[PDB]
Amino acid sequence: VPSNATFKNKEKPQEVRKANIIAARSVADAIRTSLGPKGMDKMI
């Protein structure tokens, strides 16, 4: 059950995908406050 089959290598892509999701959800949080009739305008 252990020690057999295969072992995962180069686990950085697992962290790269996490860094891409966290950075994308951070952008979606600022625009989330503008959703619906109760949303607010964003001055840039």
């Binding site: 089959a5 295969t6 180069k10 892509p13």
Partner: protein, 518 residues
Amino acid sequence: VQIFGDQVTEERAENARLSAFVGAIAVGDLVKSTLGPKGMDKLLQSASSNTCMVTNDGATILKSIPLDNPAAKVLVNISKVQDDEVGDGTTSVTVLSAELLREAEKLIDQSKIHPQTIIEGYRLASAAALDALTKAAVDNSHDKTMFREDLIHIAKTTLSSKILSQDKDHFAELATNAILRLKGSTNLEHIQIIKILGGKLSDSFLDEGFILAKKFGNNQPKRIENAKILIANTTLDTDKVKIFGTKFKVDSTAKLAQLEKAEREKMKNKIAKISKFGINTFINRQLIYDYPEQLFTDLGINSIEHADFEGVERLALVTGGEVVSTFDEPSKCKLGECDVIEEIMLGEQPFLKFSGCKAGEACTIVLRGATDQTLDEAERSLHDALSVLSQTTKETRTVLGGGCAEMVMSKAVDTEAQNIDGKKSLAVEAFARALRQLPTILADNAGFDSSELVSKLRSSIYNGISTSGLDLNNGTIADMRQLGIVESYKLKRAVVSSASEAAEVLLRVDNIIRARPR
């Protein structure tokens, strides 16, 4: 004594080499994860302009990433040459050329073999590998039914690694019909690719006729039935008089008023010669002024201006006519006919659509995607698929893919390795194990154990069955004839030839002299 100068980096002997081996390992590991249908795409961020690109092609990755290693550029150039001559397999060439050095790294180290002796091992191994791959090829184009079916299997194999792999089932017919309409002429200038935002990837449809984005004249109607299409090389513009090199000498303004009127009648007489053809549609290569445009309204002639150099030949072949310059003789330059010139709109930009033309010698592909990162890859995904399908028209020899081709070539290498006396026999067996690294990575990127799949595939071919291959969906050994995996012989021959020659260059480098950068 330092003869070279200040700030001159040089490595010699064991320092000179192992700079080329680490260079191939660093370059090979970048495209190692992109090999196979389960491979992962790599994102490239530019140091300036903040431009990002998502690409699965091993050639486009090596061109964007700056590399100061002289041996790294060796693997970059072979990826461009493989992209120039074929366009597919650029990732496999970089990996296979790197695995030849990884095996040769232990040959000089563990077995203590001279580098030139290893070169003689690849020469005898590559000669036997190309002979076994040629005999495994199957003749094509003898039957028009089998020729069309083989092109569908090639498009499914190339697009398997692309992001199109989900929708490639519907895209196999998209890329196949574009090649059959070329009538044997191989060019990608006749195939147009338009990017559109919105929808889904599978919404991409094949264009009947030729579609090119243009705009009608101000007073010209959108839809004309049975319109005649003509393309003119000459542009309607102020020509001076004839030879240029002149200016008017006006003694009195009484003749100056009739002088400008004479220039208005010159372009008016040129349109009168065009109206002798009875055309309902006119196409110009460059911008048309408003003065000649009004002459097309009274004559019922459509106008298309600002045509690109590629758009001139794409439109002329679909309609069947040829580009007219002098307009003098009406009998020459017989013109085709288009059924529907009515313009449609895809997205926020209207696209002029044609239907029911005489010839399909040129094609147009419409692509729809969510972001430009997908559209940038969707164009390069079909560009690699249409390149192999276009080369398959002239080159009919095809072989089985799916990791089977690399294993069949390695079978003949181990057969002739037993009859080769000397230390160069170890370099011959190293070429066979290097061919097994390509199907090994196919299992690693798919999440399956490579030691189990390669061992079952290696022992199955020695039993006399050459149709066995790797199935990544079920994670077992399956037949390539049933799964429909077919690749062209020119594709696999270019991978083995380019990788074997690239590894020979870096094994011949005993010194590296780096001049001071400018």
